[PDB]
Design an enzyme around this catalytic site. Sequence first.
Site, PDB file in Angstrom:
ATOM      1  N   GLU A   4     -38.662  50.524  22.374  1.00  0.00           N
ATOM      2  CA  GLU A   4     -37.295  50.929  22.047  1.00  0.00           C
ATOM      3  C   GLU A   4     -36.302  50.058  22.762  1.00  0.00           C
ATOM      4  OE1 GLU A   4     -36.280  55.015  22.594  1.00  0.00           O
ATOM      5  OE2 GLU A   4     -38.203  55.776  21.811  1.00  0.00           O
ATOM      6  N   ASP A  37     -34.712  63.871  21.328  1.00  0.00           N
ATOM      7  CA  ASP A  37     -33.519  63.437  20.597  1.00  0.00           C
ATOM      8  C   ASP A  37     -33.766  63.364  19.089  1.00  0.00           C
ATOM      9  OD1 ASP A  37     -30.849  62.403  20.303  1.00  0.00           O
ATOM     10  OD2 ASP A  37     -31.611  60.358  20.350  1.00  0.00           O
ATOM     11  N   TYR A  79     -27.209  52.583  27.591  1.00  0.00           N
ATOM     12  CA  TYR A  79     -27.065  53.649  28.586  1.00  0.00           C
ATOM     13  C   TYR A  79     -26.813  53.114  29.991  1.00  0.00           C
ATOM     14  CZ  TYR A  79     -28.892  56.742  24.953  1.00  0.00           C
ATOM     15  OH  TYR A  79     -29.062  57.440  23.787  1.00  0.00           O
ATOM     16  N   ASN A  83     -44.268  59.855  24.756  1.00  0.00           N
ATOM     17  CA  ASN A  83     -42.981  59.173  24.750  1.00  0.00           C
ATOM     18  C   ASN A  83     -42.083  59.741  25.821  1.00  0.00           C
ATOM     19  OD1 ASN A  83     -41.013  57.291  23.148  1.00  0.00           O
ATOM     20  ND2 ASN A  83     -39.882  59.157  23.614  1.00  0.00           N
ATOM     21  N   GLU A  84     -41.824  58.926  26.838  1.00  0.00           N
ATOM     22  CA  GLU A  84     -40.901  59.255  27.927  1.00  0.00           C
ATOM     23  C   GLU A  84     -41.226  60.545  28.688  1.00  0.00           C
ATOM     24  OE1 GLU A  84     -37.066  59.004  26.039  1.00  0.00           O
ATOM     25  OE2 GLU A  84     -37.200  56.815  25.922  1.00  0.00           O
ATOM     26  N   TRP A 136     -35.355  50.336  18.273  1.00  0.00           N
ATOM     27  CA  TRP A 136     -34.980  51.718  18.014  1.00  0.00           C
ATOM     28  C   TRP A 136     -33.628  51.703  17.332  1.00  0.00           C
ATOM     29  CZ3 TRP A 136     -37.942  55.595  17.839  1.00  0.00           C
ATOM     30  CH2 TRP A 136     -37.420  56.896  17.773  1.00  0.00           C
ATOM     31  N   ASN A 161     -39.467  51.589  26.801  1.00  0.00           N
ATOM     32  CA  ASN A 161     -38.224  51.923  26.139  1.00  0.00           C
ATOM     33  C   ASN A 161     -37.102  51.576  27.095  1.00  0.00           C
ATOM     34  OD1 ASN A 161     -39.896  53.077  24.250  1.00  0.00           O
ATOM     35  ND2 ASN A 161     -39.316  55.183  24.697  1.00  0.00           N
ATOM     36  N   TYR A 220     -32.772  50.516  27.625  1.00  0.00           N
ATOM     37  CA  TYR A 220     -31.414  50.544  27.103  1.00  0.00           C
ATOM     38  C   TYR A 220     -30.425  49.865  28.040  1.00  0.00           C
ATOM     39  CZ  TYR A 220     -33.250  53.391  23.386  1.00  0.00           C
ATOM     40  OH  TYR A 220     -33.920  53.820  22.270  1.00  0.00           O
TER      41      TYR A 220
HETATM   42  O1  LIG Z   1     -31.475  57.913  23.175  1.00  0.00           O
HETATM   43  C1  LIG Z   1     -32.107  57.344  22.169  1.00  0.00           C
HETATM   44  O2  LIG Z   1     -31.509  56.850  21.219  1.00  0.00           O
HETATM   45  C2  LIG Z   1     -33.601  57.320  22.194  1.00  0.00           C
HETATM   46  C3  LIG Z   1     -34.095  57.228  23.629  1.00  0.00           C
HETATM   47  N1  LIG Z   1     -35.556  57.249  23.639  1.00  0.00           N
HETATM   48  C4  LIG Z   1     -36.210  58.335  22.928  1.00  0.00           C
HETATM   49  C5  LIG Z   1     -35.677  58.432  21.501  1.00  0.00           C
HETATM   50  O3  LIG Z   1     -36.269  59.567  20.869  1.00  0.00           O
HETATM   51  C6  LIG Z   1     -34.167  58.561  21.515  1.00  0.00           C
HETATM   52  O4  LIG Z   1     -33.687  58.685  20.179  1.00  0.00           O
END
Ligand SMILES: O=C(O)[C@H]1CNC[C@@H](O)[C@@H]1O
Lengths: 596, 589
Positions: free
Chosen positions: A511, A166, A477, A416-417, A556, A471, A473
């Site tokens: 994040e 992303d 999300y 990362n992920e 993030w 990370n 959300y």
């Molecule tokens: O979806 C997002 O905002 C982040 C999710 N994790 C990875 C990030 O690079 C990405 O920008």
Amino acid sequence: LEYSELYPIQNEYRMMQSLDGMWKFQFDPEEIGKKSGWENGLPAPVSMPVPSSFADFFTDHKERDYCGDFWYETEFYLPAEWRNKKIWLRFGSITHRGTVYCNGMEITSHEGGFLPVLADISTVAKPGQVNQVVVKINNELNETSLPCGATKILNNGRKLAKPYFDFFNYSGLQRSVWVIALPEESVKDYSVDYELCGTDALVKYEVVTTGEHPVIVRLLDAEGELVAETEGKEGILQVANARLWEVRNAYLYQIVILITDGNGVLDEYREKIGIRTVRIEGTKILLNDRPVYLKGFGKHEDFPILGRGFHWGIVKRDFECLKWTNANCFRTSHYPYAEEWYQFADEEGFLIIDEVPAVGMMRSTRNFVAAGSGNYTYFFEALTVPELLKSHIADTEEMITRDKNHPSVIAWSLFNEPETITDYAYEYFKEVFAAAETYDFQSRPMTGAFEKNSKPELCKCYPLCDFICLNRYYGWYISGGPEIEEAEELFRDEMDRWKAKELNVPFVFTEFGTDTMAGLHKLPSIMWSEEYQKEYLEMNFRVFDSYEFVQGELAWNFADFQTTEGIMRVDGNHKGVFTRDRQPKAAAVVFKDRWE
Amino acid sequence: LEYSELYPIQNEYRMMQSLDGMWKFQFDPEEIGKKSGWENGLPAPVSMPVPSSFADFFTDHKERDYCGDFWYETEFYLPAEWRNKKIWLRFGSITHRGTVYCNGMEITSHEGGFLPVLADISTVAKPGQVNQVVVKINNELNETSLPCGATKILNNGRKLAKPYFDFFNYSGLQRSVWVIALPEESVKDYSVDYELCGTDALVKYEVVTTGEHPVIVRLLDAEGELVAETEGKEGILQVANARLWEVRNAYLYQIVILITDGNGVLDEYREKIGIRTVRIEGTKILLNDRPVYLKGFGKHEDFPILGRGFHWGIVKRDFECLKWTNANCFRTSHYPYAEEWYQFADEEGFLIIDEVPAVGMMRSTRNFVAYFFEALTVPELLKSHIADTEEMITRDKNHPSVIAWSLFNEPETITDYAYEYFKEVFAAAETYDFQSRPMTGAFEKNSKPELCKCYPLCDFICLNRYYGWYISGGPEIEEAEELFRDEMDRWKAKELNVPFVFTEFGTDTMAGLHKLPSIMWSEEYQKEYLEMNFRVFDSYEFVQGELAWNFADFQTTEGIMRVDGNHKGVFTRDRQPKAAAVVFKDRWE
Ligand SMILES: O=C(O)[C@H]1CNC[C@@H](O)[C@@H]1O
Ligand SMILES: O=C(O)[C@H]1CNC[C@@H](O)[C@@H]1O
């Protein structure tokens, strides 16, 4: 490495000349440059600033979005007095991969767009004359090099980068370029490691040179006074009443490494270092034997027009903003940054999690970018993964060799992920972690950032980590907006599962955030509003604070940043706490107040 | 229908009194109102404007997002003279479904949130006294009523609407409410249809009354002069030198329908109508025998704070904007609008595609949010859809502006199940429309030309397409254009000999987002996208209309893909033009 990662300096033995400025530049869509002799000069170039990403200068889509081979050229006068030196071109980076030519001769190639490229031009350099450098660069994305993605060929033959990550596929010569001169026998590498002994400290070291002459190592305090001196390519410097490098309270000594032949000095390398220890003890991250709670952000190298182009002004503003929030830490999401960022963190007492560009390794994303138009059946991981591993390990070696001696760097993030839920992923990452430990003289904490797909019941890779970075959300999300109470329940359910595992390791959230459009206000809040960003963060804090083993929070992102355009990205990623021009949204004060 | 859809009027025979204003209002999360006597008055109400959607007044999420049962109440004095009239409450709408009580007595219930609800309170009304109305309303979404969706229950019992459609689930009493009085024997319905005879015209009509007394029908011109008069509940009015209702150049006659008792009049109904014909002939849409190319927008009933609340001010501004763009048409996406919109379109000479709320009939979107037409609930959904269709057509048929019915937006259409379902809807629509004017629906891209079973039902075909937005957007826009042309070449190859109208195309566009070169979401990309679409449209002779999505930015459910609603507006939500508005203006001139 067959070259030195050491940052260039200017002294009696070593010389440097910046090649920054306006270079010549030419796109090569037909891939004809080498057979057409472009290494001897570009036939129809335009001007291109260096350092900068090329994309955002242009006013037309095809140039902005260019994917494939493209070339840079410049000329420089080499001082006659450099005659009796080893002469190198040093690129801060070449994004993503390239071949360096000098005076028409092929010098070296490099894969990996975020670490230095060193080209030994000693045999072709013309001291006391104008010299030429030409670089063939390629910015395609694939599954055998980092960061990962695909390259789509449009009906007309035009290439388009399709990231599995992303962030916008910025490329070019994004960091400063130097031509440098080194003594024929030189300091190629050194490593320091620290031990605290009450009021005193020990600086254990190793030095690698390109010859056999004796080495002397001295340590100077911040005032230039000699505090320790020893001899040998391996040794220990004993520092009485050491002034430790502390979080947000730096102190830097200067190490001085001399090669001698008895009669005189052959080379001198100097660099600022900070005496500090880092270790994980149970669920605590210990800096100089005291727990520290990480507070800060993931960042990017990203700024209007320059793209990822390095500028000290961006560093200065960003650090002032970081200090204003009361942060103490950032992660170099998702690639090593220009060296200058770390030099400055060292000065400002910031903690860095240094991240290799192992991003884009999630299968669902790969499959999605393949299904677009179009593919659902053909993938060849069995073949590409072994090559990817080699690239990942190489980048890891380069990152650690470059960055190990910064006191700011307290941990390596090795991914990362990625996919982590198979034994195959474990075997892959075991090799990366093994390599990292081998290359790091300090054997400091190793980690990676995990996506939610790496469920506690399924993930095979967290045991490789010294601390675990998540990370998440929940509230963006997952169950965003009107469902935020459900999001909190789901988040607590997951963290309860981690808790019940009793891993006795620290967890850091690397994040969490919400896209937030500056100026979008709503009462009651909605996703995308400034108020929702605040409420989401407050909910996350309540969760974090419910678990003893959570020992850090990096939001993030520090600032809004550029991504590939699409239906989910409204002029890039708006999860910034600051805008792209570095001004605070309402949520910035929420962090400031909490972190105070 | 066992009530009249006719718009209320005030004359010697008919009376009306507005109940608009601040009503009492109470949420009923525990669903206990009817168990607890709320039909006799709400126990702890707050004030709520009518007409308005309730959601955007509140400052807390739970009230804004309320889903379930909620109640309205007001009181009104009924004039003593209304005694022995048939007395009705007339709600412009009750969104989505509700039960009307008056003086503590259950009167009627209605399913469907975008058409009038008539409640006969004749037997409970108290003339010369204060009377009470209480309404229980529910705004949940399901798969047996329109528009379709689901309802989620959060772990604490709180309901949340989960639409299968891209608009916010506004609800409440969104249109004006009247109490009215009608004669015992009244005009309940009428229908007009037109035939052009050189310089003259015929107005064919039918009238339905609630009695057996004779009917006289008169037609007055725009100055009120008598131009035609005939006797009978069925007949023809002959108009010499008829002034036709023309696109963007309206002329309205007034039909006058009288019920007589010999020496006296028992009832009189009057309404403005326009003499015009519409028909599909080959690939052309003919208005008064001349081809017309449709130019305009899908709209919404959507405005800041009011939500879907009706206000003449929104009508006026919107029509001024439409005229400034040189538009001639809009679609009532995705539900019938307040009647006043059509009255105004009649005056302004705008063409309307009138759309029933058959939106959210998608399996993908249904499956994600939650084989649509294969679900056992389907027979029930069909009944609801047909009912709403009958109501829409009966309400709107006599507007000259209404030139087509849209009977769906983006349903599944690629199975025989879908065909059998829509065959019934179209058959019903045909029975209700005295004019048999063109019927259509808006198709999503999943309705591939090779797979769609439902396009043969349509008099003309409406396509919603997002080549350059959801498909190959941004750097891939040249691929998008190729894909679009590929699809249209496939339609062309079928040689269907019917007009195609694009009922949607657009890009989310943030006002003030400028970029050179353009990016998706920028004002510049909106312009470039539109220019590409025009090139495609103009490549096919059978394309005979373009209605952009959307006239204005509008509210949606929150989510990661909606930055304060839908930003595909050509105008902002407060009705100001983005850069793309000029592009339409210049093209449509
Ligand atoms: O979806 C997002 O905002 C982040 C999710 N994790 C990875 C990030 O690079 C990405 O920008
Ligand atoms: O996605 C969109 O912008 C539109 C797609 N077609 C249906 C509309 O209701 C919706 O708003």
